[PDB]
Design a protein around this nucleic acid. Structure first.
Length: 82
RNA sequence: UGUUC
């Protein structure tokens, strides 16, 4: 799998945590280019997604963030395309 | 619901 630069995997996304709220958090690190929430074939969120930036970010530092939204702690990692 | 509908 390839590690995608300037992109963060985000799991544990509550179904109420919408794009605006995701950007509200991640904007502290840069200008968000894309938020992609992965859904199943009926459009139901799988509870994870990918946030990418226009600027260079330190992904290893971002993934250290301890943060909770809607009573779920976010599960962060580098983004890998299998 | 853990790595790209």
């Amino acid at each position: 799998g390839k590690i995608m630069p300037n992109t963060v995997f985000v799991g544990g996304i509550d179904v109420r945590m919408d794009e605006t709220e995701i950007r509200s958090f991640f904007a502290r690190y840069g200008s968000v280019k894309e938020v992609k929430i992965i859904t199943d074939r009926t459009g139901v969120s799988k509870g994870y997604g990918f946030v990418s930036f226009y600027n260079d970010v330190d992904v290893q530092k971002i993934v250290e963030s301890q943060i909770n939204f809607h009573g779920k702690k976010l599960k962060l990692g580098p983004a890998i395309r299998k």
